[PDB]
Amino acid sequence: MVLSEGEWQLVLHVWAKVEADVAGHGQDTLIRLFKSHPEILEKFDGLKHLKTEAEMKASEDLKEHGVTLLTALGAILKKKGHHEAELKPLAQSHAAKHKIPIKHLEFFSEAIIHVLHSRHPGDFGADAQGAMNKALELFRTDIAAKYKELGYQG
Numbered sequence: 001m002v003l004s005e006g007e008w009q010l011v012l013h014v015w016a017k018v019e020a021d022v023a024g025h026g027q028d029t030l031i032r033l034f035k036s037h038p039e040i041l042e043k044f045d046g047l048k049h050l051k052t053e054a055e056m057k058a059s060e061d062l063k064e065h066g067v068t069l070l071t072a073l074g075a076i077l078k079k080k081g082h083h084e085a086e087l088k089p090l091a092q093s094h095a096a097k098h099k100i101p102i103k104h105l106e107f108f109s110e111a112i113i114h115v116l117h118s119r120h121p122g123d124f125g126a127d128a129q130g131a132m133n134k135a136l137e138l139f140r141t142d143i144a145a146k147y148k149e150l151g152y153q154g
């Protein structure tokens with residue numbers, strides 16, 4: 001699967017809205033993800049004690065995790081599929097002690113898509129929704145192949 005130049009443009013146009021406030025988008029995304037999938041919070045050794053939305057919003061560690069995640073994802077998206085160099089260390093990091101199943105990356109993808117619908121509907125119409133679905137699917141497909149190269153089936 002590939003994305004066209006037009007699909008990439010839609011993806012990066014809505015991503016520019018995320019970049020206007022990376023930390024806030026990261027908090028919204030992670031809080032949504034952890035409420036929807038408490039098992040995923042267990043994969044973050046330093047965050048797993050957090051329970052209430054106010055406590056999660058107060059956590060500097062959670063905020064930093066959201067910035068790390070979204071900054072790395074933005075760099076990957078701006079590679080427009082030519083992301084082998086970025087995905088290889090990311091696969092390794094996610095295949096250390098806490099293996100991150102592909103399904104958790106899919107749940108993450110659902111969370112960021114929800115945040116985009118909620119925050120930026122004017123820049124997240126039908127065509128942009130389709131393109132973002134495909135961009136995150138491509139990321140997950142290619143990560144899965146890099147997992148396998150390292151001996152992790154995902």
Ligand code: HEM
Pocket residue numbers: 040043044068069070072073076090093094096098100104105108
């Ligand atoms: C459900 C989703 C995810 C979980 C549970 C998760 C979990 C983790 C964990 C446990 C590590 C630590 C490895 C270590 O301790 O050395 C890590 C590292 C990292 N992850 Fe994720 N991750 C997720 C999604 C993502 C995504 C989507 C991205 C970017 C596209 C990302 C970017 C990074 C980066 C850059 C690092 C290395 C920097 C650091 O250690 O803070 N993560 N992740």
